[PDB]
Structure 1
Amino acid sequence: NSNICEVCNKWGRLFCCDTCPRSFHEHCHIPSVEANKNPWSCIFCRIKTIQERCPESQSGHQESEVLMRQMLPEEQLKCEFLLLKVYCDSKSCFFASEPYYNREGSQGPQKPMWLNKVKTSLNEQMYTRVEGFVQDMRLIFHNHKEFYREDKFTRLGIQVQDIFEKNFRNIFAIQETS
């Protein structure tokens, strides 16, 4: 197994996947690493199993159809993994915790959002459809764009949104287009 956390790339108290070489801090893994369960398989392994049990799940889909899906166990898992993939980028640190807004010439967003709030929302099963999760994810970056305006710090929002969107297209097998 790896000697660093797959998500945050640091050493520490790590739990090791029994089916691949990755390791995680307890609360870096999503969901949080389970108390018992020997063997334990990580979320990367659980996602791989879904594609193996249904190879056709990787044929192209329309985003509109994906969004309307109910959050049954396999969609729930896919959203948890997509969220994990955003936390894997070091730039997620800017969007992890509850922000605040006091900038000359800007007003705060009507509906603030942040990655740890989405994490809690997923953990507490508050999303009934994929759409709920994706809307809040996209809201994070939209709020950032709007608030920071022409400051070059807006680019962080763009960069972390691009990570989200690529992973969304991959995980949910969105039909490739030009």
Structure 2
Amino acid sequence: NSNICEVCNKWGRLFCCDTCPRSFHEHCHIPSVEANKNPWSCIFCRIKTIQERCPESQSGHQESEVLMRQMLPEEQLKCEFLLLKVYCDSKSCFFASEPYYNREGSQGPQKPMWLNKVKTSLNEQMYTRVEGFVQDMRLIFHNHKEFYREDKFTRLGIQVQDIFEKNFRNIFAIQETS
């Protein structure tokens, strides 16, 4: 197995996947690495299994249809993985914890949002549809863009949103377009 966490790229107290060579810190994995379970399969393996069991799940889909799906176990898992994929980018540190807003010439957002809050919301099964999760994720970046205005720091929002969106299209097999 790997000697660093797949998500944060640091060594430490790591749990090793039994079906692939990835390793994770306990709370870097999403969901948090389970207490017992031998063997244990990580979320990358669990997502691969879903695909292999239903090859047709990779045919293209309309985003509108994906968003209206109820958060049954497989959609819950796919959102957990998509959230993990954003945490895998080091620039996610900017959006992880609860932000605050005091900048001359700007006003804070009406509805602040951050990755740790989405993580808790998923853990507590607060989303009933994929739409709920996707709206919160997109809100994180939209709030950032609106607040930082013409400061070049706005680009961090664009960058992390692109990681989100690419992984969203991949995981939920959105129909490719120009």
Q: Distance in 2 between matches of 1:121 and 1:176?
A: 30
* Residue 111 of structure 1, CA deviation: 0.2
* Residue 62 of structure 1, CA deviation: 0.0
SS at match of 2:155: helix
Q: Distance in 2 between matches of 1:51 and 1:82?
A: 15
Tell me which residue corresponds to 2:54.
Answer: 54
Q: Distance in 1 between matches of 2:57 and 2:114?
A: 30
* Residue 97 of structure 1, CA deviation: 0.1
Q: Distance in 2 between matches of 1:40 and 1:73?
A: 18
Is 1:156 the counterpart of 2:156? The answer is yes
Q: Distance in 1 between matches of 2:32 and 2:41?
A: 12
Partner deviation per Cα, 1:29-58 (whole Å, 9 max, x = no partner): 000000000000000000000000000000
Q: Distance in 2 between matches of 1:119 and 1:142?
A: 18
Partner deviation per Cα, 1:124-172 (whole Å, 9 max, x = no partner): 0000000000000000000000000000000000000000000000000
SS at match of 1:162: helix
Q: Distance in 2 between matches of 1:169 and 1:52?
A: 18
Unaligned 5+ runs, structure 1? none
| Runs of 4 or more consecutive aligned structure 1 residues displaced over 2 Å after TM superposition | none
Over the aligned positions, Cα root-mean-square deviation in angstroms equals 0.1
* Residue 173 of structure 1, CA deviation: 0.1
* Residue 119 of structure 1, CA deviation: 0.0
Q: Distance in 1 between matches of 2:166 and 2:101?
A: 29
Partner deviation per Cα, 1:92-113 (whole Å, 9 max, x = no partner): 0000000000000000000000
Q: Distance in 1 between matches of 2:105 and 2:54?
A: 52
Unaligned 5+ runs, structure 2? none
Q: Distance in 1 between matches of 2:155 and 2:60?
A: 30
Q: Distance in 1 between matches of 2:102 and 2:165?
A: 29
* Residue 8 of structure 1, CA deviation: 0.1
SS at match of 2:51: helix
Q: Distance in 1 between matches of 2:166 and 2:159?
A: 11
Query: When the two structures are superposed, what TM-score results if normalisation uses the length of structure 2?
Result: 1.00
Q: Distance in 1 between matches of 2:134 and 2:62?
A: 14
* Residue 12 of structure 1, CA deviation: 0.2
Query: When the two structures are superposed, what TM-score results if normalisation uses the length of structure 1?
Result: 1.00
Partner deviation per Cα, 1:77-100 (whole Å, 9 max, x = no partner): 000000000000000000000000
* Residue 6 of structure 1, CA deviation: 0.0
Q: Distance in 1 between matches of 2:133 and 2:176?
A: 22
Percent of paired sites with the same residue = 100
Tell me which residue corresponds to 1:127.
Answer: 127
